[PDB]
From Swiss-Prot:
The keyword rRNA-binding does not apply. It is found in: Nucleus, Nucleolus. InterPro entries: eL8/uL1-like, Ribosomal_uL1-like, Ribosomal_uL1/biogenesis. Pfam families: Ribosomal_L1. Involved in rRNA-processing and ribosome biosynthesis. Present with 3060 molecules/cell in log phase SD medium. The keyword Transport does not apply. Its main location: nucleus. One of its GO terms (molecular function) is RNA binding. Keywords: Nucleus, Ribosome biogenesis, rRNA processing. Component of the 90S pre-ribosomes. Interacts with FAF1. This is Ribosome biogenesis protein UTP30.
Length: 233
């Protein structure tokens, strides 16, 4: 069909055009009938990829922003076999506000949800997710609470890298990363796009899914530098 033809042409264009080296992420652009009708939030919502997985944490350079002082979380995560190489840098929110683009050295940034509102552009991967350093309630061995639970952190990061995300808006269209050139085959990409579409138009999955309003007018596929190829009209 058409859609398979579109990806095959974009993958080829990434191998033929010298401009499209260091083009990596593949995004679809969904144009909808109405504005999404959500006041802009700027916190990533997760979109669940079922069959395949976008990334694994070990793929990316991840930045962790924590409650200040960060020393405790840095030391615990760093000295634990499950999380030693998980992050690239662990810094306090104060350390980050003093640096203030800003994340141009990181593929991903996750912040302690407790310091999220203290953080300082539309089209940006590096918008921070929220995570917990500790389970709100652990049933196992309750006489001890972990302020920083490196398995639980890794869990959260696994679930962030393998899925994809979107940033709610009151916008006519919405972009969503669906694959990595060379890292995903044409079927894996396409499966990711359908998952994206199924979730985003499933009214049972509200409030995060089923957000698209007014139907889907079109869906294009794109890299940063390439042409916008129609996937569905």
């Amino acid at each position: 069909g058409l859609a398979e033809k579109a990806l095959k042409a974009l993958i080829l264009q990434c191998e033929e055009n010298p401009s499209l080296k260091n083009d990596k992420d593949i995004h679809i652009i969904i144009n909808t009938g109405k504005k999404m009708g959500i006041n802009r939030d700027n916190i990533p919502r997760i979109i669940p990829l079922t069959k395949y997985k976008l990334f694994k944490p070990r793929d990316l350079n991840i930045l962790l922003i924590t409650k200040d002082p960060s020393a405790l979380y840095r030391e615990t995560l760093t000295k634990d076999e499950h999380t030693s190489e998980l992050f690239k840098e662990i810094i306090s929110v104060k350390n980050l506000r003093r640096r203030f683009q800003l994340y141009k050295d990181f593929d991903l940034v996750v912040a302690d949800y407790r310091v999220h509102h203290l953080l300082p552009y539309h089209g940006s991967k590096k918008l921070p997710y929220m995570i917990r350093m500790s389970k709100e309630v652990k049933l196992k061995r309750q006489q001890m609470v972990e302020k920083c639970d490196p398995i639980y952190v890794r869990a959260q990061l696994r679930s962030i890298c393998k899925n994809t995300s979107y940033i709610p808006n009151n916008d006519n269209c919405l972009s969503v990363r669906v694959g990595y050139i060379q890292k995903h085959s044409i079927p894996e990409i396409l499966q990711n796009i359908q998952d994206t579409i199924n979730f985003l138009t499933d009214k049972s999955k509200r409030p995060q899914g089923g957000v698209i309003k007014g139907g889907i007018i079109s869906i294009f596929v794109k890299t940063s530098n390439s042409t916008s190829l129609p996937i569905y009209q």
